[PDB]
Structures are given as structure tokens and as C-alpha cells.
């Protein structure tokens, strides 16, 4: 239990908290912090980027309520034409499709707002302003919400370019969850190549990039030359 | 409200009760009645057929308990690796497959016992004994449980020969549910032909047989020259 | 279907929407509107009252998430010591008490913030500022959230002074839900007097005030000299 | 792991299986065994006692289906008048009371049949016939179902005379669950005395009898001079 290992355990928990599924307490904390950063930044394009990012998260939060209400309404129905096991299976499959289609619509609306937030941050041309902690914090939040919205619906290939942009920001590369999700997203791509009998150069590329992020995630949370890091190094070597 | 129409409404309800999903009260009533009929019949092959039929229904009843217990056990688990919507969908799909596989195993065991019940009734060669009400009652119960087990798992083509044997017994042809299930089973076959671009002679045969049973089911529960019977006749004509 | 009757049906729906249980879409709409009114008002005490009101609603919204998460955690447990019906009853009664105690704690925190919002509005002494639409809108929202928090936990007597202050604001007296909840709250008090064999002057007072608000709620949504209004007048007369 | 300790672990599991909540597989096994014992016994009073015992268990089994169907029907209703937390609490409390009242009715009908089973066994006067394994097996099954029906509804004092009659039969005194339930039932009585400030002679009697059965249950499943038996002896000493 070194000063650095205690700092590690606390930091991994703080990083896991950062990547937590959105809820009310987290929404309130995020937007209270972002609105103060907007006041300190006093930049019109940042204000417009924040407004779009907030609308995008609001789309997600509204959809979370829609799904609970829809499931409640479906549970409260009497099913007179459900004598057979296959009928109840079919009905649950139709309900799951309605939920999936509404979540896809909410994700599309949310990504349109995130894309607009990015368009406003692209308008901040001054390199000194782009290096500001306020700028990097909002950019990280937009990308993280974007990655999570795609990941939730199993759009793992779509998360890869966003996660790669995210890890380039400040010290985001030291984030164990960013590496864990990147590793899984590359794994999905490797598996898609193996399943579709795709080209070997792509298989090896995806396998390599999965291993890079799997090794980095292990190193970050367990440390270099620990039983977890040494083990992953041995299988790859 | 004629003497015959009052007799019709009461009879359709009694027929719907006959085709009800198996529960404890129905099981107890069925086997108490069958065991008394076995005593009156005093025939060793009937006794052995009844024992196999009972074992087959017992398989079904035991499986009903297994499914409720399995669903209860699955609901009582903490899911630490279920952050994403697609993960919960996948997990529910795995649970539904375990349920489907166990129901298929119970159906196979139940049909093996029903087949053995039929083998023992086939050993009763004396034509006077085969015409006995006890014989026809057990034969109807075996076929009805067999049809229902297949129908529950969406094995509608498999129900067709069994339903056709069932309706030949005594006055079973006057049963609205037997015609309703036959009509749906022929409809499934017609739809399979249309979906697989099968031969026209089969399409027309299945369409015709669906219409025969749809018309008969309507005639039986609503009566000839009623607004329901006249309507179905017009669409077919 | 007169111009006024069409205006009535639309208005009752808008009033029912105003008194709807809090959800994310409603929270977002309320605080986006209140924050713009704060900008137009440009008053420091209004800003502080709005901040306290928002913290109070946030307490309620956070508690809604806490309850769903608690119920989920309780459902996901295996109960090895629950062989008997009375054990499952007792366990559900303990879960309901934990929920009730947490909701009472959240209500107490929310009412402390609403009380602080009212303290800041009490600091706005200028009679011209107290007559502003921004002032009356925030005051109505604070009282309505306060009434609803108390009503949710069955604190109906506590809602009476708040509902009476609420109906005095602008045209809030024309609100069918305000009269409906007042009528029920007075009914609870009348029933408490009858149950505790309380004094007749209190029984008659509560009965009268229940009737006043029951009659007003009927008049507002069905109109004067309609089959609903005429009926209530006849029973009271 | 001695020959006796392996015999102990297997036997405690067989005893726990004997006291398991009734389900279809257990019902089928019990009545198939009892009907064969009836054939070997060839006694008319035993046949009538078995018929009453079966009707009593059937009452219980039918009620298990009734409760699941009632809960299903209640879950499938839309509740338009359930805006408030207290309304949903009240509604669930009304549902629990309907379930409790139906279970009490089924228990009363089941105990009337068990009492009739006992009346028929009381008619078997020949001491040689009363010592028969068939007689003792049916008597144990009647008492065990009777105890369990009472225990399920928290009628623990009512179970005490039945458990005391049960443990007198053959080697039923070697049954760990019989002692465990007796200990809990005496504990309930001790707690009722402490709660109602009842007489000390009753408190000490119930405390003593609770300890007798708690010590015996420990001795039976863990063995004499084991860490579990030695411990319970020390607290009592």
C-alpha cells in the first residue's frame, strides 16, 4: 500500500465514476460544473457548444424516462391472445424492437447535438483558447457521452475514432476505462473479420490494437511489474 | 336466446375449458375421472395406456414448475457485467434459449409417453372394446395433450395429423377449439409455402383446409345463417 | 363545443400537466423557463430563491433514482431464509419501511430548501417587484412542489395552508387540481375528526371547506349549470 | 468424514427434502407411494384417511395456483388513481390482505380434511394395524402437511401440539427439521409472554422447551461433542 498505489485505487474509482451510466445526480453535477466553466471562459462559441451538449444529454435523459414508462405500460396490459409459449416470446420480441427503435432515434438526435457542440468548438480557432482547461473539459465530456451512447447500442466500431480522439486530450490516455472500451471495440472488429473471413492484414491490425489497449488498461489499474501486468505481457510475448 | 343458443354458449365455454392450459385443479379432475373409467373398463391395456398418459402429463406439470423456479433464480442474480443495453438484451436472449431448450426436452419426454399410451390402446383389438366411452375419452385426452404440447412450442404442422385424428373421435368434430387450432395450423403451412415460394398445389390445398376449419369453427360457435357465418361464406364465395 | 368549452378542455389538460409528477422533461422545461425569468428579473434575492428551489427539486429527483436503484438491489437478492409466506410478507414490509424513511428524509431536505426559497422571496420588499410575473411564477412553483412533496407521503393536513396560499396567487384560484387536492385534504381532516370523535365545530368546518373546493373543482372543469355542477349543488342543498 | 458423518450429511438433506414446500414432483411422488402402501395395507379406514389427506393437499396445491393467477391479474391492471406514493402502498396492502384471506380459507379447508384423515386413522383400533409402517407413514404425512400449513401463515403456537405428536412417531424424533420448527414455535411463545408481560412460569417453560429443541436440532445435524454442540451447551450451562 504505497502513496502511489493508494492514489491508484482512488483514481480508478474516480475514473469508473466518470464513465458511469447517466443518472440525475451525475447530470446535475456535470452541468453545474460546465456552467461555471462557461462563466470563467466567457466565450460565445463555448456557450453554444455547451448548450448543444446539454440538449444532447437531455435527449438521453428523456429517453431513459420514456423506456421505463413504456415498459410499465406494457406490463399493465391484459393479454387475452397469449395462450401459447411462442406468443409470449413473440410479444416480448416486439416490445424489445419498439425499445431498440426508440433508443436508436434518441441516439441519432443526441449525436446530432454532440456533432453541433463539436462544430462550435471547431469555431474556436485561437490556439491559446483551445489549450484552456475549460475547452478540454467540455471536449472530453462531449466525446465521452458520444462514445457511451454508441457503446450502449452495440455500435462498437463507431466508438473507435471517438475513443482515439478522447485519449489524445490532456491526460485522458491515463484512463483505464478509455483503454478497456477501446480494447473491447477492437476485439469486436477482430471477431467481425474472423466471422466474415475478412483480410488477414485487418485481423492482425485489430488483434494488435486490442492487445495494446488491453495491456495499457492492465498497466494503469494494476501497475507495471505486478502479477496482472507480467501475466498479460507473457501471453502476448 | 333459444334453447339451442343457450346450449351453444354453455357448450363453447365447456369446450374452451377442455382446451385450457394445464393447471393443478384440471390435472386432479382429469386423473380422478380417468382412474374411475379405468376401474369400470377393467382392461389391462387401458390401465397401461392411462399410466403412460399420466406420466406424460406429469412431465408437462413438472416442467411448468421448473420454468417458474428457473425464472425466479435468474431474477435473483446481481449482474455486475451489464452496463450496456445490448448486454441485458443478450442475457435475456440466453435465458429464453435455456427455457426453450428445457421445454423442448420436456415435450420430447411427454410425447414419448403419449406415443406409448397410443401403443397400449393399439393393443386393444376387440372392436367392441374400442367403441367403449372409456376408450374414446382416454384417446381424446392423449391426442388433446399431444396437440397442446406441440402447439405451445409453435410446432403447428406437427399438430395437423393429431387434430385430424382427434376430430374423427365420437362428436369431437363439433368442437370449436379443434377447428380453430386446425385452421391456424393450416394457415401456418399456407404462409410457409408463400414464404418459401413452394408449389401452388400445396398453397391452394393449405388455403382450402384453413378455410374449411375457419368456416366450421364460425358455424359451431355462432350458428348457420348468423351475421358471423354469412360473412365468412361471402369472403370465401 | 363552444369557444369557451374548447378553451376549458385544453386548459384542464394544461392544468393537469402543471400538477404532473416530476420527470426529466418537466424538470428541464421548468428550470430553462425559470432561468430566463431570472435573467429578465435581474434581482439578487430572486436568483437566490431560484437556486434554493432548484436544490429542493434536485433532492426530489435524486430520491426518485435512489428508490428505483434500491428496489432493483432488493429484487436481485437470493432469499435463503424465506420458506414461509409470513417471512416474505415481513421482508417486503421492511423494504417498504426503508423506502418510506428515505422518502421522508428527502422530503425534509426538499422542504428545508423550499423554505429557504420563500425566505429569499420574503426579502423582496418593494411591492412593485412582488407583483412581477416572474415573482408570482416562482412563488407558485415553490408552493406547488411543496404541496406535492407533502401530498406524496400522505401529509394532507400539512398541504392545506400551502394550497390556500397557492390559490391566492394571480389566477391560481381557477385551477381545478388546486381545488381537487384542497377538497381531498379537507376530507382527510373531516375523517380524522370523525375517527378521533373530535369536536363538532371542527367536523362541520372541515366538511364545509371540503364541499367548497369539491363544488369549485366541478364548476371549473364542467362549467356552471352543467349536469355535473347541478348534481353536486343538489346533494349539498 | 466417518461412515456415520457421511450418513448424517445425506440424512439431513433427505430430511430437508421431506420438509420442502409442496410442488408438483413432490406431490406426485408422495401420492404414488401412499397409493401403493394403501394397496398393501388393504384397509378401508386407511383408504378413507388417504382420500381425505389427498383432498387436503389438493386444497393447498390449488391455492398455490390461485395466488399466482391473482398476482398476475393484479399486475396486469392500469392504475389511473395512483399518482401518490401512499396510494400504491395502500393498494399493495389491499392485495396482500386478499391473498392472506384466501390462504386462510384454503388452510381452514385443508385442516378440515386433515382432521377427517385423523378421524379415519382413529377408527383403526387393532393395535397390530396401528404399528404398521403404512399407518405410521400416512400419520407422519398428515401431521407434517398440517404443521406446514399452520407454519406458513405464522400460526406457530398451533404447530406445537402437532409437532409433539409427530416426533413421537417411529424415529421422527431423529429429524432435525422437526426440532428446528419446534424450537422456533416455542421461541414465538416465549416472545409472546415477554411482549404481553405474561407469567414467569410460562416464560421459563417456553424458554426451556425452545432450548431443548434448539440443542437437539444442533446435536442431530452436527453431532455430539462437535464445535456446534459444545457451543450451544456452554450458553445454556
Q: Which residues of D touch B58 (CB under 8 A)?
A: 24, 28
Helix (H, G, I), strand (E, B) or coil at B155: coil
Q: Provide the residue count of chain C.
A: 237
- CA distance between the termini of chain A: 29
Q: For cell 391472445, what's the residue?
A: A81
- Opening angle at CA D64, ends D59 and D67, nearest 5: 120
Q: List B residues 184-213 in contact with D (Cβ-Cβ < 8 A).
A: none
Rounded to 5°, the CA angle D157-D162-D164 comes to: 95
Give the C-alpha distances (Å, rounded to integers) separating D151 from C36, C86, D164: 63, 9, 14
Question: Computed from CA positions of residues C74, C80, C83, C87, in that sequence, does the dihedral angle turn out positive or negative?
Answer: negative
Where is A80: in which H helix or E strand?
A: none
Looking up cell 382420500 gives D51
Residue with cell 421482508: C91
Distance CA B10, CA B26 (A): 18
Dihedral angle of Cα A184, A185, A191, A197, to the nearest 10 degrees: -160
Instruction: Give me Rg for the CA atoms of chain C.
Output: 21
Residues 6+ apart with CB under 8 A from D68: B68
Alpha-carbon gap, residue D225 to D237, rounded angstroms: 15
Residue C182 CA to residue C66 CA, distance in Å, equals 30
The percent of chain B in helix, strand and coil, each rounded to the nearest 5, is 85, 0, 15
Closest chain B residue to the Cα of C73, Cα to Cα: B78
Evaluate the CA torsion angle B101, B103, B107, B110 in order and state its sign. positive
Torsion of CA A108, A114, A117, A121, to 10 degrees: -130
Residue positions counted in chain A: 237
Q: Which residues of D are less than 8 Å from B23 in CB distance?
A: 65
How far apart are alpha carbons D172 and D158 in whole angstroms?
Answer: 19
Task: Give the span between the Cα atoms of B54 and B50, in whole angstroms.
Answer: 6
- Give residue for cell 363439433: B174
Give the integer Cα–Cα distance in Å for B56 and B115.
Answer: 9
- How far apart are the CA of B5 and the nearest CA of chain A, in angstroms? 24
Long-range contacts of A218-226 (CB under 8 A, 24+ apart): A220/A12, A220/A174, A220/A175, A220/A176, A220/A179, A221/A8, A221/A12, A221/A176, A223/A5, A223/A8
**Pairwise CB contact (< 8 Å): A28 & C65:** no
Among C23, C36, C106, the strongest candidate for a mutation testing the A interface, having the largest count of A CBs within 10 A, is C23
**C-alpha distances in Å from residue D16, one per residue of B229, C83, D10:** 60, 12, 10
Contact D110, D144 (CB under 8 A): no
Q: Report d(CA B135, CA B115) in Å as an integer.
A: 15
* Cα separations in angstroms, D125 against D43, D129, D131, D162: 12, 8, 11, 21
* Stated length of chain B: 237
Which residue shows C-alpha cell 388513481? D81
> Are D221 and D8 spatial neighbours (Cβ–Cβ below 8 Å)?
yes
Helix (H, G, I), strand (E, B) or coil at A169: coil
* Chain D interface, best mutation among B24, B28, B68, by max D CB count within 10 A: B24
Collapsed DSSP state (helix, strand, coil) of residue B224: coil
Burial class (CB within 10 angstroms; exposed 0-12, middle 13-18, buried 19+) of D128: exposed
CA-nearest of C116, C1, C123 to C55 is C116
Contacts of B65 in chain D (CB under 8 A): 23-25
Q: Is D119 near chain C, with CB under 8 Å?
A: no
In C19-58, the residues whose Cβ lies within 8 Å of chain A are 23-25, 28, 58
Distance CA A189, CA A206 (A): 6
Q: Does B88 touch chain C (CB under 8 A)?
A: no
| Residue B226 to residue C28: CA distance in whole angstroms | 58
C84 part of contact set with chain D, CB < 8 Å: yes
Q: Measure C78 CA to nearest chain B CA, in Å.
A: 5
D232 burial level (CB within 10 Å; 0-12, 13-18, 19+): middle
* DSSP-derived 3-state class of residue C19: coil
| Helix, coil or strand: residue C171 | coil
The backbone torsions φ and ψ at residue B25, rounded to the nearest 5 degrees and listed phi first, read: -55, -45
Phi, psi of B182, rounded to the nearest 5 degrees: -65, -45
Resolution in A: 1.9
Q: How far does D209 lie from chain C, in Å, by closest CA?
A: 22
Name residue, grid cell 473471413.
Answer: A197
d(CA A174, CA B140): 72
Chains that touch A (3 or more CB pairs under 8 A): B, C, D
Q: CB A25 to CB C65 under 8 A?
A: yes
d(CA B94, CA B82): 14
Q: Is the CB of residue D202 less than 8 Å from the CB of residue D175? A: no
Beta carbons within 8 Å of D125's beta carbon, 6+ residues apart = none
Burial profile A92-121: b = 16 or more Cβ within 10 angstroms, e = fewer: eeeeeeebeeebeebbebbbebbebbbebb
DSSP codes of every residue in D141-187: HHHHHHHHHHHHTT-HHHHHHHHHHHHHSTTGGG-HHHHHHHHHHHH
Chains C and D: how many Cβ contacts under 8 Å? 28
- Give the residue ranges of DSSP H helices in chain C: 3-18, 24-41, 44-75, 85-122, 127-130, 133-152, 156-168, 176-196, 200-222, 227-236
**Minimal CA separation from C191 to chain B, in Å:** 42
DSSP string, C116-132: HHHHHHHT---HHHHTS
Considering only CB atoms, which chain B residues are within 8 Å of C78?
73, 76-77
Nearest to A153 among B21, B85, B152 (CB): B85
Residue C226, phi then psi, degrees to nearest 5: -115, 165
Of B21, B83, B154, the CB nearest to A21: B83
DSSP state of D123: T
On whether the CB atoms of residues B49 and B134 are closer than 8 A, the answer is no
The helix/strand/coil state of C83 is: coil
Cα-based angle C134, C135, C137 (whole degrees, multiple of 5): 65
Three-class DSSP category at B123: coil
H helix count then E strand count, chain A? 10, 0
CB D161 within 8 A of CB D72: no
**Residue B190, CA distances (Å) to B147, B205, D66 in order:** 19, 8, 39
Question: Which of C66, C38, C65 has the alpha carbon at shortest distance from C52?
Answer: C38
Distance CA B175, CA D136 (A): 48
Question: What ranges make up the beta strands (E) of chain B?
Answer: none
Q: What crossing angle do the helices spanning C133-152 and C24-41 adopt, rounded to 10°?
A: 150
Contact criterion met (CB below 8 Å) for C200 and C206? no
User: Best mutation site among B17, B79, B80, B84 for testing chain A: the one with the most A CBs within 10 Å?
Assistant: B84
Reference A152, options A217, A24, A64; nearest CA is: A64
The angle subtended at Cα B14 by Cα B12 and Cα B15, nearest 5°, is 60
Query: Looking at chain D, which residue has its C-alpha nearest residue A73?
Result: D78
Q: Helix A200-222 and helix A176-196: axis angle, to 10°?
A: 160
User: Around B87, how many Cα atoms within 13 Å sit in the side-chain half-sphere?
Assistant: 9
Q: Which residues contact B195 (CB under 8 A, 6 or more apart)?
A: none
Which alpha helices (H) appear in chain D, and where do they start and end?
A: 3-18, 24-41, 44-75, 85-122, 127-130, 133-152, 156-168, 176-196, 200-222, 227-236
Rounded CA gap, C39 and C55, in Å?
A: 19
**Domain locations in chain C?**
22-154
Q: How far apart are alpha carbons A55 and D90 in whole angstroms? A: 39
Chain A residues closer than 8 Å to B154 by CB: 84-86
The answer, for B151 touching chain A at a CB cutoff of 8 Å, is: yes
Measure the CA–CA gap between D225 and D1, rounded to whole angstroms.
15
Return d(Cα D174, Cα A198) in angstroms, integer: 69
Q: How many CB atoms lie within 10 A of CB C59?
A: 20
Min Cα–Cα distance to chain A from B92, Å: 10
CB contact under 8 A, D65 and B23: yes
Can you tell me which residue has the cell 419498439?
Answer: A98
CA pair distance D66, B22, nearest whole angstrom:
13
What is the least distance, in Å, from the CA of B46 to any CA of chain A? 30
Q: CA C8, C12, C17, C19 torsion: positive or negative?
A: positive
Angle at A49 between CA A47 and CA A53, to 5 degrees: 115
Amino acid at each position: 500500500l504505497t502513496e502511489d498505489q493508494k492514489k491508484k485505487k482512488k483514481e480508478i474509482m474516480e475514473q469508473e465514476s466518470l464513465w458511469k451510466n447517466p443518472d440525475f445526480k451525475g447530470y446535475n453535477k456535470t452541468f453545474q460544473e460546465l456552467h461555471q466553466l462557461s462563466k470563467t471562459f466567457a466565450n460565445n462559441q463555448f456557450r453554444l457548444a455547451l448548450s448543444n451538449y446539454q440538449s444532447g444529454v437531455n435527449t438521453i435523459m428523456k429517453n431513459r424516462d420514456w423506456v421505463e414508462q413504456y415498459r410499465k405500460e406494457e406490463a399493465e396490459k391484459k393479454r387475452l391472445d397469449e395462450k401459447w409459449y411462442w406468443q409470449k416470446v413473440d410479444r416480448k420480441a416486439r416490445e424489445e424492437r419498439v425499445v431498440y427503435r426508440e433508443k436508436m432515434k434518441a441516439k441519432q438526435d443526441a449525436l446530432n447535438y454532440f456533432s453541433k457542440a463539436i462544430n462550435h468548438l471547431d469555431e474556436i480557432k485561437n490556439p491559446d483558447l483551445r489549450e484552456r482547461p475549460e475547452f478540454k473539459r467540455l471536449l472530453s465530456d462531449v466525446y465521452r457521452s458520444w462514445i457511451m451512447a454508441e457503446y450502449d447500442l452495440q455500435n462498437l466500431p463507431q466508438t473507435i475514432p471517438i475513443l482515439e480522439l478522447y485519449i489524445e486530450i490532456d491526460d485522458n490516455e491515463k484512463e483505464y476505462p478509455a483503454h478497456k472500451y477501446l480494447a473491447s471495440a477492437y476485439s469486436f472488429e477482430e471477431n467481425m473479420i474472423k466471422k466474415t473471413k475478412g483480410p488477414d492484414d485487418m485481423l492482425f491490425k485489430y488483434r494488435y490494437k486490442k492487445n495494446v489497449h488491453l495491456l495499457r488498461a492492465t498497466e494503469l489499474k494494476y501497475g507495471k511489474d505486478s502479477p496482472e501486468y507480467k501475466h498479460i505481457v507473457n501471453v502476448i510475448n
